[PDB]
């Protein structure tokens, strides 16, 4: 899968205006939604060479597990997650498993284009059937996880618009990565060059239609790269 996208943002106060605008522009009011994502990385205690059976270089990457959480269980899975039996309300739940590549290279790209390998986990059984054990069985460990809540809009040609808020989850507390406003995302998922240039056009027309009001641009490739690497001191 190829995901073509553009991003933007607005502060909390810009909410109502944006919702009103997207509702008129798309013809439908927003739809509430959420998702919990847990990111996993190769176990650092284990170490393997980074090469094929064909002796070809393989880059270590993170695996992303995602699914929706009923809103009624939201506090339970975030704040009150620990003390297992301290709550308000067998096998693993279904999950979406994804590994993505750093977006396609190119100066003056009209949109971001990212390849995404995904498979679906439906269930489990056996000794260690928890999704956590299963990830460990693959040689991975839990790294971090975040909750995203927002509204989406279905538009023409498969264009989708998400207005989102993101919270990282830890016992020490959830911190809002998007504190201040909403992360705006417009995208289309593409399973032929044509449909790719057509999809770019759809995104470009949406960008054009919001120019002046809210700007949508291509984020930095490096900001969309989940590959594992070091312990680098930033700047």
């Amino acid at each position: 899968v190829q995901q073509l996208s553009l991003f933007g943002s607005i502060g909390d106060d810009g909410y109502d205006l944006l919702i009103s605008t997207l509702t008129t522009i798309s013809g439908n009011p927003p739809l509430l939604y959420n998702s919990l994502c847990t990111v996993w990385k190769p176990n650092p205690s284990y170490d393997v060479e980074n090469v094929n059976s064909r002796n070809q270089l393989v880059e270590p990457n993170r695996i992303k597990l995602s699914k929706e959480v009923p809103f009624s269980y939201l506090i339970d899975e975030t704040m009150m997650d620990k003390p297992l039996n301290f709550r308000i309300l067998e096998s693993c739940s279904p999950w979406s498993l994804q590994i993505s590549d750093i977006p396609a290279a190119g100066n003056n790209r009209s949109v971001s284009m990212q390849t995404i390998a995904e498979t679906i986990i439906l269930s489990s059984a056996g000794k260690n059937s928890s999704v956590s054990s299963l990830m460990n069985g693959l040689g991975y460990v839990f790294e971090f996880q975040y909750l995203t809540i927002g509204v989406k809009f279905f538009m023409k040609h498969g264009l989708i618009l998400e207005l989102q808020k993101i919270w990282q989850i830890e016992e020490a507390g959830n911190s809002q990565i998007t504190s201040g406003g909403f992360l705006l995302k417009a995208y289309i998922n593409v399973s032929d060059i044509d449909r790719i240039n057509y999809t770019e056009t759809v995104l470009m027309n949406l960008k054009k239609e919001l120019q002046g009001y809210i700007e949508l641009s291509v984020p930095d490739r490096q900001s969309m790269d989940s590959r594992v690497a070091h312990g680098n001191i930033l700047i």
Binding site: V39, I166, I177, G181
Partner: peptide, 22 residues
Amino acid sequence: PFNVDDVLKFTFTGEKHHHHHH
């Protein structure tokens, strides 16, 4: 409000910045 790139970078790698970069 915040830096789009930084927010995205977090969702893809988990890093939060206590300092301003670039």
